[PDB]
Amino acid sequence: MDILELSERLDLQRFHSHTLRLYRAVCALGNNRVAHALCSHVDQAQLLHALEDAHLPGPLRAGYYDLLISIHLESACRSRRSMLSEYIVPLTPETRAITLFPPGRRHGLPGVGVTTSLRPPHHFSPPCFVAALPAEAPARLSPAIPLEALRDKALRMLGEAVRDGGQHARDPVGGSVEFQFVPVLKLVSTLLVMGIFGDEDVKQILKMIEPEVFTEEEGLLQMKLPESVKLQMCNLLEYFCDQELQHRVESLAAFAERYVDKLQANQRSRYALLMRAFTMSAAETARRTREFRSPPQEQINMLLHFKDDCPLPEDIRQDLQDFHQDLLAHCGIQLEPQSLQELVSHMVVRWAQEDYVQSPELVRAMFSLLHRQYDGLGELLRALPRAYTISPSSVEDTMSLLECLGQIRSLLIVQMGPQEENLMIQSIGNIMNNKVFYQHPNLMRALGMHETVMEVMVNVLGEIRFPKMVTSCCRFLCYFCRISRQNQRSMFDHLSYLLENSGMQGSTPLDVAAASVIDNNELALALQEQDLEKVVSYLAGCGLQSCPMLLAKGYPDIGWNPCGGERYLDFLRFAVFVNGESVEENANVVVRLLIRKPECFGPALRGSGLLAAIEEAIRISEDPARDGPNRVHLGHAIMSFYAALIDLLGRCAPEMHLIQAGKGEALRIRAILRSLVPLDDLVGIISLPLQIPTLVQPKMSASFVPDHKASMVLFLDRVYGIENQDFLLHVLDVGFLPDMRAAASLDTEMALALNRYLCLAVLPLITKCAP
Amino acid sequence: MADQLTEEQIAEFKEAFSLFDKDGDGTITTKALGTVMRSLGQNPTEAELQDMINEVNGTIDFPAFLTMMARKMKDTDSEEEIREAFRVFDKDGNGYISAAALRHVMTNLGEKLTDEEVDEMIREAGQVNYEAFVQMMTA
Amino acid sequence: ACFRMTPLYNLPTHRACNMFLESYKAAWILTEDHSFEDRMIDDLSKAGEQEKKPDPLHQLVLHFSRTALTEKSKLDEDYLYMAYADIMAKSCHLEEEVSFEEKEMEKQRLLYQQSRLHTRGAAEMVLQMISACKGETGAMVSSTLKLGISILNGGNAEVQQKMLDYLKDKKEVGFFQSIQALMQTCSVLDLNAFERQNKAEGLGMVNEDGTVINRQNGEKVMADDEFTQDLFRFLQLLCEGHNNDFQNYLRTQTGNTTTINIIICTVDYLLRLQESISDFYWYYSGKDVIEEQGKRNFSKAMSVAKQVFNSLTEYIQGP
Amino acid sequence: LVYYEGGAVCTHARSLWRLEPLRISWSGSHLRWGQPLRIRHVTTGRYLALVVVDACKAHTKATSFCFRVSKEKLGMGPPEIKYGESLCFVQHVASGLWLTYALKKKAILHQEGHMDDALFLTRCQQEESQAARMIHSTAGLYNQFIKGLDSFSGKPRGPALPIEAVILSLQDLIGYFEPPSEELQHEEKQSKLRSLRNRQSLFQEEGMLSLVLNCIDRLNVYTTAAHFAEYAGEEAAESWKEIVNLLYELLASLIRGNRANCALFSTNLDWVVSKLDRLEASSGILEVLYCVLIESPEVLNIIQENHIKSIISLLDKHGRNHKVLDVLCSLCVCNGVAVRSNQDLITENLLPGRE
Amino acid sequence: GVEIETISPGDGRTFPKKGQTCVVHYTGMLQNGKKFDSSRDRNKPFKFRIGKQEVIKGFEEGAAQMSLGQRAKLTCTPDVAYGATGHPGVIPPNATLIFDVELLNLE
C-alpha cells in the first residue's frame, strides 16, 4: 500500500512510528557494526526521498529525519563536538595572518573566514553487502552518504520553509508548523557542527535567519514560533557564538607569534648591550637578575608589567596596548542592531515578553546564551586554559594522537564488553609511544586525558570483570605521573577515591597512589591525616586473615598475610621518606596511629623471637611440604613482609640533628622504636650465612635474599646507633666478613643481588664509623 | 621527572627506537638495547646493561626504554652543572671569586634571599675557591 | 640551579607563546574591570512592560526555584546558577563627611534594588537552596550566601516577613538542620597544618623552570574563613531590626516537629573557637617576637570572632 | 521476640505502637502517671505481654503495663505526659519488671533494671498511621485467602473462600497507589510524589510484595479458566478472570517509578518472563515488565538470549502491539549507556527474517 | 552453483581478465524476492578488482563469465557465499542469493 495512507490509517502509523524508535535505539551511541545492518533495510535513496515528500504525516516525518542522523551523522557528530572545547593551533603562516577585525572597525561575520584549529577527519566507509566475512575485527566505521549532495538538498528544504512560512498557509507540511521546522533544523544544526558547510553556504544561512543584519523576505526570528522550534534556534545560535570565540582565540594566537618573535631579538640585543656595559657593578646585577638568574616563566611575568620597572622600549610596549584596545572593542565592552550580541540580547529578552515559557529546557538554553554575550570577556577567559600552541612540524603526529584519543571517549559511554577492552588496550598502547604525550605535558593535562582514563577505571571496579584492562590503565597513570611534577600534582587530587579501592598479580590502583606522592615534599607535606588512617585500616585486616586465593591454590594455611599486607608498607615507606630524608609531621602521626591497632604488626612480635621468626621461615621455605605448592612461596613472603615492617620504622626515625636538640616529642618517638625491638635479635639476622652460588644456582623467590638484610641495617643505623669501638667490632667479624669473602669468592646471579646490597647498606655504615 | 631531557633527544631517541623497533610495536630485544645505544655512540658494558632491565621479560617498551634514558643523562649533568655555575661569579672563570663581589650577586638572583641568609650563607662557608663552594652549596 | 636558567631567545617559540598566555591573561585580562552587572538586570526587569504575566527576571528565579525543589540526595554544582548568583548579588553592592539627606538616597536606592529582586520572589529561592544543600559545604553555598546578604543588607524588614511565613506554612525541618550542619564544619585555628604550611613556606622556587604557585597551596590553615564569616554575617542579618519573632523562632521552631535552637548552636562554635584561639597563644607564649605569617593567621581568627559576637548580640539586642 | 534497632527500622512499619488503657470510655483522655494500659503492635495486631502475643490470649493479668517515672516505693485528663521530655520506662503492673536489653539488643523484663530505661516517646504521622492499619486488614484477608485456596490445592471437587471480599479490597489499593496527574501544578506534583515514594517503600519492606507474589503463584497453575477452576466449583470460577488482572495491576502500581523496589525482581526475573504467553492478562504482565525495565538498570545486563527470544515470540502471537516495541526500546540503553551485548541479540533475531 | 541466465547480450567477445578492475551496476534480492540491496539508489557504479577475492565467490565467478555490456541474472548457492552464519543483520543463515548485474565497462 502507499505510505501516505498512514495519514488516515492512524493505527499502522503508530506501529510504524514506534518501529522507527527501535531503529534509532539499536544503532545508538556509535554501534557501527549494526549501523551497516540497518543500511540494508532502509536504503540510501528512499531515505533521501523521504526528506521532502511533504504529504508525509506528522510523527513519521520526525522519524525519517532522526533516523538519518542516527545512522550516518552521529558517530562523527560526538567526536567532533568533543574536540570543540579545546583549541590547538599550529604555526603555519596562514595562522600568522589572522586579525580580530577584517581589514577594510567594522565587525566581521561570525563563522565566516579561515580557522586553523586541528580536528580529525571523519573516516566514513561506504556500505556493501557482498564483501566476504573475515574471522576479532578491529572496528567498523560509520556508513557513508554523499555529503556534498546532501548540503544542497538540506539548504533547499530550509530555504523554502522560511519562505513558505511567510505565506501563512492553512495546510503546513507535516501537519503543523512544529513538524515543518524541528526535523529540518536539527539536521542543519548537526551539519553545521560537523563543519561540512562552505562559507558561502553559511553566508546564505545568515541571510535566512535575519537578513537585515548579516547582509554584506521576512527574517526567521520575527516569525511567530512555537516553543520547541525556539529550542533548535538556540542550538543553532550556540554554534555561532563559539565561532566568534574560536576566531578570537585564533586571533590572539596569531598576535603572540608576531609579538614574541619581536620580543626575543629585543632581549638578545639588550643583553648584548648588557654584555658590553662595564659602567656599573652594583646596579649591573639588578639588570642581571632577569637575564640568566630568573626562570623564563618569571621573565615574561616581569616583562609584561607596563599597565598603569620594565626593560622594554616604548615602541613595542604600546602596540600591545593598541592590541588590547582592539580586543575589548571586539568584545561587548564599548571601551570609551548592527551587532550579533546586540541581536541576541534583543531577541532573547523579547522571547520572554512573548509568553510565559513552561518548558524548562528552553529557559535554560535561553539564559545560558544571554549571559554568554554580556560577560563576553569572561567567556573568553574560561576557554583560555584550554588554549595551547604547538609547532607546525608536530601536526603530522598530533592529529594521529587525537584520533587515538577519540576512541577512548567513545568508550566512555558504552558499557564495557570483552571486545572493546581490546580496543582500549590497543588504543592506550598506541598513545604511550606517540612522542608528543611527553614533550607537552601541559597539553595532555589540558585535554583532560588524565581525567578520561580514570573514569574507565571507575566503571569497571564498580569481583573483577576485566583484569587485563585495569592493569594497563593504571600502568598508564604510573607512567604519566613522572612526566612532569604538576601532572603528579593533578593525579594526587583523586587520592581518597584511589584509596577506597585498594582491593592480585600485575599492577594495581594503589601503585598509582604510590607514584602520586613519591619524590615530592610539597605533596607529602600536604597529605591529609584522614587519608592516612584509611591506609592502616586495610593494614588492620591483613594480619588477621589469609589470602583466600592462596588457600584456593592449595597452599598451607597461614593466619596472616605475608603477601597482601606488604602491598601497603611499600606505599607508606614513600609516605614519610623523601629525597633521602625523613619528614617530621607525617612520621609523628603514622606511629601514633600504628600503635592503636597492635594487630597491624606481624604477630610473631605482637610473641616469638624476631630472628626466630625468620628461623621459623627458613624451615617452611626449605621444606617444600610446609612451602606453598606456584609463583607464591609462603616462606619467601614472610621474610619479605618483615623486611617491610622494619625499614618503614627506620624511615620514620627522627633525624640526628633533632636529637642533638632537646625536642622531647622527637625523642619520645626514638624511645618507642628502640623499646619495641631488641638489638640482639638483629645481630643474629645480620650474621646468618647464605647459600652462595657455585659449582648450581639457588632459587631467589624461595630463599634468603640480601634485601632481607638490607632492611635491618637501616634500622639500627638510624634509631639505635653505633657508639663504641667494641660493639662496632662485635657485629663486624660475625656478619660481614663471612659475606665479603663470599662476595670476593665469585670475582653470577646472587653475586649481583649482593654486590649492590653491600655497596648500598653496609659500606656506608663502615664509613660512618671509620674514625 | 622525564622533563629534564630536551625535545630533540627524544626526537633522536624515537628515531633510534623506531629504527630498531621489532614490528612497529615498540618492543625490542635485550640485545638490541645495547646495539641502539652504540648506534647513539653510547658504549656501556653489560654491567650497565644488566642492572637497567632488572630495574624495570626481554620485552623493552618505549616508555620503559625512555625512563632509563632519563636516568643515564640525569646523573652526568648533575655534576657538570656546578662548575659552570661558578663560572659567572669569578671575572676570569678559574675559581677566584672575591667575597666582595658576592653579596650583590646573591641577593639579586630570584629565590628572594634576603641579607640575613646570604650572610648566613657566607660566615658558615679574601677570595674563596670553587670546590669549597660546590661543597658549601650542596652540603 | 638558579644560575643555569636559559634565556627566552634560546627557547622554541611555541613554548614562549604558551607562557605568554599564562602571563597575558594573568596581568591584563584578569585585571580588567567592567560594570555589566547592572545594565543586565534593568532590561530583565523593565521588559515586563510591553504593548499578570511574569517578568523576564521573574521567570528566571522561578526556574532556579524549581530546580531546587526536585528530590535529590545531593545538590549538583551548576556553574550557570553560580554565574547568575553573583550578578544578582552585585545589583545591590553598588549602593552597599556626609550630609543627612544624601545618605538617605544612598540608602533608599538600595531599597529600590532590594525591591527589584524580592518582589519577584528572590527571597524564597535563597531560602530553599539552603534546605537543598543539607550540609554539603561546597562552592554553591558560597555563591548563594552572597546573594542572601545583598538582599538582607542594611537590615531590610519585609524580606524577614517574607521569610518567617515561609518557615511557618511549610514547617520545613531541614533548613535548620542544614544550618546546624554548616555550623559544625567551620574550621578553626589548628596547631598541626600551621607548621605544615611553615615547612612548606621554606621553599620559594621549585626546580626545572617551575614556580611554586603560592596561591595553589594558599592558606591550608583556615581556608574556610571567609565562608564561615559570611554565614554568621547572614545570620546576624536575620534579626537586625530586632524582629522579636525571630528571637523566638531561632531558639524554637514551635510550629515544626523538632527544634534546633541555633542560638545554642552559635554558642558551641564559639567555645570551639575559644580553645582554638587559646592554644594558639600557648604556642607563642614562649616565643618573643611574631613573624609575618603568625599575625595573618591571628588576624583571621579575630575577624571571624568579631562577626560572631556581633551575630550573638543581635539575638539579644532586643530585650 | 522484642528487639531494638538503629534508624532504618525506626521509620518503617514495625516501630509503630499504640496505647490502650483499660477503661473503655474516654480512652482518648490525657494519660497520667501510674495508669494501666495495654500495648498493641499495629501490623501484626498482636499484644505485647517480654514477648508479643495474640489478642485472644492477651489477658489483663498476663499483659497490663504502665508508665512510671522512677520507682519510688509507691472526661478528659490533665496534660500530664509531654512529648520528648518525659523519659519514662515501662514495667508490668502485676510484676514490676523493667523491660531492658541484654545490634539486636534483646529487650527483656529484668528486675535489676539499668540506667538506660529512661526512654522518650515520639508521636507518629497521620498519613503513615493510616497506611499502617490497612496492612493488617489486608494480610489478614490474604493469608486467609491463600490457605483457603491451599485446602483444595490437591483435592478435586466432584469453608468458602472470600471472593467478594478480596475483589473490592484490591480496587481500593489501586486507587490508593495511583500516580498523580500530569496536569497538576509542578510544586504540588513533586510534593505528592515523595508521599507516594514512602508508602510503597512502606509496603514492600514490611512484607506485602512477596505476599502478593504468592497469591499469583497459587492461582496461575489453573490455565484453563474454568476446568482447572472447577477444583473450587462454579462459584469462584466466574471471578477467576478478574482476580488475576487486578493482581498484576497492583504489582505494577507498586514498582512504578521506585528504583529500590525494582531491584527486588533481579532474582526472579525469569519468573516474570515465563508467564508472558499465559493468555490471561497478557497486557497485565507486559505492563509489569515495562515499569521494572526503566527504573533499575542492573536488570538489563542480567538478560540472556533465552529471554529475548520469548519477547519476539510474544509479538508474533499477540499482533502488532505497540507496547512491545517500548520494552525493546528500553532494552538497548540505560542512563545514556548502551549494552552492546543486547544490541545484537535483537538485531540478528528480529530483522533478518524480514517477516 | 553459479547459474548465469542472460537478460541482454553484450559484445560477446570482450571478457574481464585477471589483475583488472570492473564496474558493475548491480542489484540483489533473496529467493522470497525482498530487495536487500541495490546500487543505482546510491547512484554509484560499484567497482572492484577481479581475482583478489574482495567480493564473495559466487560474484566474481559470475563476473568473468560475462561479456562487456551484457546483463545477466546470477544465482549464488548457499555454499558459495555466507554459508553457515550469513551476514550479521542482513542475510539469514543458509540463504540462496539472486543477483542482477551489468558490466558497465573496463573489460
Side-chain angles (χ1 to χ4, degrees), chain A residues 493-499 501 503-504 506-518:
Chain A
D493 315 327
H494 303 157
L495 187 58
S496 46
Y497 173 66
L498 281 156
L499 215 57
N501 311 312
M504 49 92 70
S507 166
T508 174
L510 189 144
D511 278 4
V512 160
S516 61
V517 287
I518 201 168

Coordinates of all heavy atoms in Angstrom, one line a residue, chain A residues 493-518, unseen atoms left out:
Chain A
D493 N 45.1 14.6 43.4 CA 43.9 15.1 44.0 C 42.8 14.0 44.1 O 41.8 14.2 44.8 CB 43.4 16.3 43.1 CG 44.5 17.2 42.8 OD1 45.4 17.3 43.7 OD2 44.5 17.8 41.7
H494 N 42.9 12.9 43.3 CA 41.9 11.9 43.4 C 42.3 10.8 44.3 O 42.0 9.6 44.1 CB 41.7 11.3 42.0 CG 41.3 12.3 41.0 ND1 41.5 12.1 39.6 CD2 40.7 13.5 41.1 CE1 41.0 13.1 39.0 NE2 40.5 14.0 39.9
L495 N 43.1 11.1 45.4 CA 43.6 10.1 46.3 C 42.6 9.3 47.1 O 42.7 8.1 47.1 CB 44.6 10.8 47.3 CG 45.4 9.8 48.1 CD1 46.2 8.9 47.2 CD2 46.3 10.6 49.1
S496 N 41.6 10.0 47.7 CA 40.7 9.3 48.5 C 39.8 8.3 47.8 O 39.5 7.3 48.3 CB 39.8 10.3 49.2 OG 39.3 11.3 48.3
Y497 N 39.5 8.6 46.5 CA 38.9 7.6 45.7 C 39.8 6.5 45.3 O 39.4 5.3 45.4 CB 38.4 8.3 44.4 CG 37.9 7.2 43.4 CD1 36.7 6.5 43.8 CD2 38.5 6.9 42.2 CE1 36.3 5.5 42.9 CE2 38.1 5.9 41.4 CZ 36.9 5.2 41.8 OH 36.5 4.2 41.0
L498 N 41.0 6.8 44.9 CA 42.0 5.8 44.7 C 42.3 4.9 45.9 O 42.6 3.7 45.8 CB 43.3 6.4 44.2 CG 43.4 6.8 42.7 CD1 44.4 7.9 42.6 CD2 43.8 5.6 41.9
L499 N 42.2 5.5 47.1 CA 42.4 4.8 48.3 C 41.2 3.9 48.6 O 41.4 2.9 49.3 CB 42.6 5.8 49.4 CG 43.6 5.3 50.5 CD1 44.9 4.9 49.9 CD2 43.7 6.4 51.5
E500 N 40.0 4.2 48.2 CA 38.8 3.4 48.5 C 38.8 2.1 47.8 O 38.1 1.2 48.2 CB 37.6 4.2 48.2
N501 N 39.6 1.9 46.8 CA 39.7 0.7 46.0 C 41.0 0.1 46.0 O 41.6 -0.3 44.9 CB 39.2 1.0 44.6 CG 37.9 1.7 44.5 OD1 36.9 1.4 45.2 ND2 37.8 2.7 43.7
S502 N 41.6 -0.1 47.2 CA 42.9 -0.8 47.3 C 42.8 -2.3 47.0 O 43.7 -2.9 46.5 CB 43.5 -0.6 48.7
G503 N 41.6 -2.9 47.2 CA 41.3 -4.3 46.9 C 41.2 -4.6 45.4 O 42.1 -5.1 44.8
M504 N 46.2 -9.2 44.1 CA 46.2 -9.7 42.8 C 47.5 -9.4 42.1 O 48.2 -8.4 42.4 CB 45.0 -9.3 42.0 CG 44.8 -7.8 42.0 SD 45.5 -6.9 40.7 CE 44.6 -7.5 39.3
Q505 N 47.9 -10.2 41.1 CA 49.2 -10.0 40.4 C 49.1 -8.9 39.4 O 48.1 -8.3 39.2 CB 49.5 -11.3 39.6
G506 N 50.3 -8.5 38.9 CA 50.4 -7.4 38.0 C 50.3 -6.1 38.8 O 50.5 -6.1 40.0
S507 N 50.0 -5.0 38.1 CA 49.9 -3.7 38.8 C 48.6 -3.6 39.5 O 47.8 -4.5 39.6 CB 50.2 -2.5 37.8 OG 49.8 -1.3 38.4
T508 N 48.3 -2.4 39.9 CA 47.2 -2.1 40.9 C 46.8 -0.7 40.9 O 47.6 0.2 40.5 CB 47.6 -2.6 42.3 OG1 46.6 -2.3 43.2 CG2 48.9 -2.0 42.7
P509 N 45.6 -0.3 41.3 CA 45.2 1.1 41.5 C 46.0 1.7 42.6 O 46.2 2.9 42.7 CB 43.8 1.0 41.9 CG 43.5 -0.4 42.2 CD 44.3 -1.1 41.2
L510 N 46.6 0.9 43.6 CA 47.3 1.5 44.7 C 48.7 2.0 44.3 O 49.2 3.0 44.8 CB 47.4 0.5 45.8 CG 47.9 1.0 47.2 CD1 47.1 0.2 48.2 CD2 49.3 0.6 47.3
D511 N 49.3 1.4 43.3 CA 50.6 1.8 42.8 C 50.5 3.1 42.0 O 51.5 3.8 41.8 CB 51.3 0.8 42.0 CG 52.0 -0.3 42.8 OD1 51.8 -0.2 44.1 OD2 52.7 -1.2 42.3
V512 N 49.3 3.4 41.5 CA 49.0 4.8 41.1 C 49.1 5.8 42.2 O 49.8 6.8 42.1 CB 47.7 4.8 40.4 CG1 47.1 6.2 40.3 CG2 47.8 4.3 39.0
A513 N 48.5 5.4 43.4 CA 48.5 6.3 44.5 C 49.9 6.5 45.1 O 50.3 7.5 45.6 CB 47.6 5.8 45.6
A514 N 50.7 5.4 45.0 CA 52.1 5.5 45.4 C 53.0 6.4 44.5 O 53.7 7.2 45.0 CB 52.8 4.1 45.5
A515 N 52.8 6.3 43.2 CA 53.6 7.2 42.3 C 53.0 8.6 42.2 O 53.4 9.4 41.4 CB 53.6 6.5 40.9
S516 N 51.9 8.8 43.0 CA 51.4 10.2 43.1 C 52.0 11.0 44.2 O 51.7 12.2 44.3 CB 49.9 10.2 43.2 OG 49.5 9.5 44.4
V517 N 52.8 10.4 45.1 CA 53.3 11.1 46.2 C 54.8 11.0 46.3 O 55.4 11.5 47.3 CB 52.6 10.7 47.5 CG1 51.2 11.2 47.6 CG2 52.6 9.2 47.6
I518 N 55.4 10.2 45.4 CA 56.8 9.9 45.5 C 57.6 11.2 45.1 O 57.1 12.0 44.4 CB 57.2 8.7 44.7 CG1 58.5 8.1 45.1 CG2 57.3 9.1 43.2 CD1 58.8 6.7 44.5

